[PDB]
Amino acid sequence: SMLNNMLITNEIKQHVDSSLDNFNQYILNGTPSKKESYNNEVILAKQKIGNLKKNSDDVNQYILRDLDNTLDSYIESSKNTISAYENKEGYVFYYDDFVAAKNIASYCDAYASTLMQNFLEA
Amino acid sequence: SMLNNMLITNEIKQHVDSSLDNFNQYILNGTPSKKESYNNEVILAKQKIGNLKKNSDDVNQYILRDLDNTLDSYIESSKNTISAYENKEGYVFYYDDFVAAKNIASYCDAYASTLMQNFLEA
Amino acid sequence: PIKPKIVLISHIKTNPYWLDIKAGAERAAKERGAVVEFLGPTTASTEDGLKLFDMATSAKVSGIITYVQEEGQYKKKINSAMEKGIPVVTIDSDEEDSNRIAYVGTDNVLAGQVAGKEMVKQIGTSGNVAIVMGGKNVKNQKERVEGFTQYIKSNSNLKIVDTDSSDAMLLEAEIITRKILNRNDNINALFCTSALDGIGAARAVKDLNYKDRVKIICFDDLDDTLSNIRNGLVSATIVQKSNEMGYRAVNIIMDKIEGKSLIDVNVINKSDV
Amino acid sequence: PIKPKIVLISHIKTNPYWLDIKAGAERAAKERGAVVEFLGPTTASTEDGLKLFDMATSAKVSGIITYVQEEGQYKKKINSAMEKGIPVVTIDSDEEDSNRIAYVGTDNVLAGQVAGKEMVKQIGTSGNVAIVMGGKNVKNQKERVEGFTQYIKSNSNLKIVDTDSSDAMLLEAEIITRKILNRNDNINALFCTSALDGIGAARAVKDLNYKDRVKIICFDDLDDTLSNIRNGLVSATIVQKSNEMGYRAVNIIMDKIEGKSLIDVNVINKSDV
Numbered sequence: 001s002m003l004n005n006m007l008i009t010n011e012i013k014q015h016v017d018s019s020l021d022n023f024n025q026y027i028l029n030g031t032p033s034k035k036e037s038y039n040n041e042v043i044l045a046k047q048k049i050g051n052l053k054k055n056s057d058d059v060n061q062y063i064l065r066d067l068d069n070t071l072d073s074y075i076e077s078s079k080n081t082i083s084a085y086e087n088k089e090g091y092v093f094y095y096d097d098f099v100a101a102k103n104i105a106s107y108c109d110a111y112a113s114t115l116m117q118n119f120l121e122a
Numbered sequence: 123s124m125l126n127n128m129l130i131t132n133e134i135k136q137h138v139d140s141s142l143d144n145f146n147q148y149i150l151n152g153t154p155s156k157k158e159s160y161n162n163e164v165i166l167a168k169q170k171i172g173n174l175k176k177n178s179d180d181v182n183q184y185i186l187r188d189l190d191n192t193l194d195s196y197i198e199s200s201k202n203t204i205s206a207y208e209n210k211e212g213y214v215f216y217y218d219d220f221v222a223a224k225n226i227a228s229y230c231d232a233y234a235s236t237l238m239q240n241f242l243e244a
Numbered sequence: 245p246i247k248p249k250i251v252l253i254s255h256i257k258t259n260p261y262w263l264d265i266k267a268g269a270e271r272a273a274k275e276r277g278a279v280v281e282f283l284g285p286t287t288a289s290t291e292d293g294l295k296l297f298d299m300a301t302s303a304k305v306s307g308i309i310t311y312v313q314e315e316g317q318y319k320k321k322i323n324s325a326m327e328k329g330i331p332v333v334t335i336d337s338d339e340e341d342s343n344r345i346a347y348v349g350t351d352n353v354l355a356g357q358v359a360g361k362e363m364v365k366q367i368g369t370s371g372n373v374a375i376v377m378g379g380k381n382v383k384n385q386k387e388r389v390e391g392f393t394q395y396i397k398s399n400s401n402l403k404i405v406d407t408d409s410s411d412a413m414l415l416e417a418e419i420i421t422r423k424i425l426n427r428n429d430n431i432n433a434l435f436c437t438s439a440l441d442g443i444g445a446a447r448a449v450k451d452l453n454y455k456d457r458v459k460i461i462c463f464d465d466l467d468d469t470l471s472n473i474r475n476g477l478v479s480a481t482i483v484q485k486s487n488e489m490g491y492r493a494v495n496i497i498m499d500k501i502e503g504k505s506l507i508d509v510n511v512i513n514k515s516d517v
Numbered sequence: 518p519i520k521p522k523i524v525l526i527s528h529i530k531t532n533p534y535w536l537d538i539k540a541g542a543e544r545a546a547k548e549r550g551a552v553v554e555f556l557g558p559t560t561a562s563t564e565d566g567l568k569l570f571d572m573a574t575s576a577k578v579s580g581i582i583t584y585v586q587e588e589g590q591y592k593k594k595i596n597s598a599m600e601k602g603i604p605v606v607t608i609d610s611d612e613e614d615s616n617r618i619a620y621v622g623t624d625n626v627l628a629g630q631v632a633g634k635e636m637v638k639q640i641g642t643s644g645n646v647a648i649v650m651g652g653k654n655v656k657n658q659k660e661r662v663e664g665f666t667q668y669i670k671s672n673s674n675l676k677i678v679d680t681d682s683s684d685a686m687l688l689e690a691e692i693i694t695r696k697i698l699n700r701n702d703n704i705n706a707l708f709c710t711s712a713l714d715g716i717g718a719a720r721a722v723k724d725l726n727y728k729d730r731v732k733i734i735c736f737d738d739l740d741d742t743l744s745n746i747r748n749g750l751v752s753a754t755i756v757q758k759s760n761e762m763g764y765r766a767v768n769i770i771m772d773k774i775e776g777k778s779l780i781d782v783n784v785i786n787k788s789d790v
């Protein structure tokens with residue numbers, strides 16, 4: 001169980017990482033399957049974070065909320081980037097969003113590894 | 123066992139983190155017990171990394187070597203900082219070492235969380 | 245049940261001044277039913293403070309209370325957070341050109357003028373002064389130096405002969421002071437503008453002797469500073485209500501959350517301690 | 518058993534030019550009994566490349582092969598690694614003022630001159646040229662533009678009327694080209710100095726038409742560029758031996774490790790493809 005929780009936590013971290021990677025490739029070349037994978041992987045990270053939130057205790061509750069909200073920020077930054085990109089706008093118009101999406105994805109990684117450590121320590 | 127390996131990996135990460143924290147406090151105020159704890163915690167991180175290296179496979183071998191060497195770099199940067207500090211030298215003389223010690227400790231954290239994920243995935 | 249989380253970002257996390265601000269924040273938070281997350285770098289860095297502010301923004305915390313290290317550098321992130329519905333309070337240095345709901349802290353230019361008035365009382369209207377500041381490009385330090393300089397220029401013939409920086413580090417405060425006393429002939433007084441500067445200066449004066457050819461006016465009421473005042477190494481310190489800053493900032497944040505509706509400085513001398 | 522690990526740091530990790538360099542490195546590494554770790558940012562960043570270089574230095578890897586984005590910016594970290602016993606090779610842009618054991622890549626100023634000679638063959642000694650470069654402050658781009666400019670100034674009356682940057686991004690190459698064709702009256706030719714610039718320029722020319730009022734001379738032999746040459750949208754491309762760079766760099770590193778002891782550019786036209 002505590003092991004199942006950190007399996008899920010590791011799955012979330014992989015989803016976020018894979019989502020970012022596909023997102024990056026999509027913005028740099030526009031292969032539609034990259035965007036499809038970007039989208040699928042955040043759907044999965046979002047759902048599994050939701051699943052853990054169902055069974056959270058007093059401490060992880062706070063971290064999960066931060067992680068869930070931070071993922072929403074990533075979703076918003078990456079969607080805004082994709083939107084400007086597909087509108088064929090100047091890089092200057094999505095530079096910030098593009099950067100923030102990378103940064104925010106890295107915050108998600110830190111919440112996830114913190115969670116994994118907490119689950120590890122029953 | 124794979125669970126024991128990631129317990130150890132988590133212990134290493136905590137040792138490195140705690141070593142950095144005490145190191146930081148020591149440079150900022152000079153409380154001798156902070157330096158003692160800095161030193162004890164890296165001794166423990168070093169030994170346990172050595173222990174995992176004894177039982178490594180084909181892949182973790184490479185990560186463990188990177189982590190072990192990176193810890194040695196942290197040890198060298200933090201000792202050089204402590205040395206200039208205790209000589210009451212100008213900040214300008216240990217600024218780089220002081221910064222590198224923080225940076226290098228963060229590299230150790232990333233190797234450790236990578237290891238923990240690999241152990242998680244038997 | 246889950247509580248609102250308020251993020252508090254400090255100049256320097258380990259510093260006993262910020263620990264007092266933290267204590268005040270924890271008191272208010274327990275009273276109001278919030279949790280405080282206390283953050284900050286080890287060595288002063290605007291860049292590091294902004295990354296922490298960015299993390300809290302992304303996490304959509306219930307409120308952010310932030311130190312402002314450099315003028316104009318926080319505006320963008322503060323306004324972005326406000327726009328996203330996160331109430332933002334600035335603490336112990338302000339970003340005036342931003343949409344933060346409130347600033348909780350000292351009027352730092354005024355605090356400088358206050359030091360200037362006390363400096364004139366301490367050594368008179370003629371003589372040489374040297375300044376030790378906690379970072380050359382740090383906002384509330386520049387403001388303190390500004391108020392001080394303005395005051396002694398209007399109300400005396402005191403000459404500022406040397407200004408340098410401790411980067412708000414204790415050891416570096418001693419060293420930069422020792423270096424300032426050397427390299428200057430007749431310094432009558434030191435003005436020290438952040439919490440550890442006075443302690444470091446006292447060490448440098450006691451070590452060269454110059455107790456007492458050199459008076460010290462410094463900032464804050466840290467234990468060793470109060471001790472140096474009793475022992476005569478420091479003549480006056482300018483005291484801030486740090487605990488009250490942390491306390492008031494949390495209550496302003498929680499007031500905004502719940503839809504409900506400049507702190508003086510004090511000169512302390514040996515007779516006061 | 519454990520193998521030496523060689524770190525390869527690219528300009529841009531996903532780019533098909535660097536993937537070809539990677540392939541060459543993997544070939545040499547398998548032959549020599551090493552492992553290659555292939556790194557790089559998504560968007561070009563000197564800062565990010567230096568952090569990766571710093572990580573490899575700290576990890577005391579057996580060798581580092583690094584791209585150099587900005588002149589003078591890598592010297593400190595390269596020399597520090599060399600001093601710590603890590604053999605360092607620079608690849609597809611050099612840091613001349615550093616103690617790296619070798620540079621493996623194009624003579625970029627020369628490659629620019631080569632483009633300049635081909636530009637004169639393509640449109641003659643009179644006319645207007647515009648330059649699309651992969652980053653205004655990127656070393657080997659500036660070097661290519663330098664060689665080109667020097668050449669056409671010595672050997673023609675061609676006027677460079679506009680220079681702007683794609684930041685080595687494909688979409689931005691198209692857009693900046695479309696913007697350059699607009700805003701300039703009579704442009705006869707485009708010179709494109711990194712791998713994706715030519716593909717983006719061809720898209721912008723085909724879309725406005727201007728096939729063919731505007732010729733394109735670009736860089737590298739990517740599939741779409743070779744295709745644009747066959748279809749007449751691109752007139753010439755300057756081809757580098759990317760695969761050979763990766764191959765040779767690993768062998769130089771492994772030679773140094775084991776204590777054992779400038780690659781030409783080629784113009785390709787439609788008749789060659």
Ligand SMILES: O[C@@H]1[C@@H](O)[C@H](O)OC[C@H]1O
Pocket residue numbers: 255256259261336378384412437438439440463464
């Ligand atoms: O900003 C703080 C300042 O108000 C105090 O004087 O010194 C410590 C600093 O961190």
Ligand SMILES: O[C@@H]1[C@@H](O)[C@H](O)OC[C@H]1O
Pocket residue numbers: 528529532534609651657685710711712713736737
């Ligand atoms: O530096 C590389 C350059 O040599 C090539 O022309 O374009 C791609 C760049 O990454």
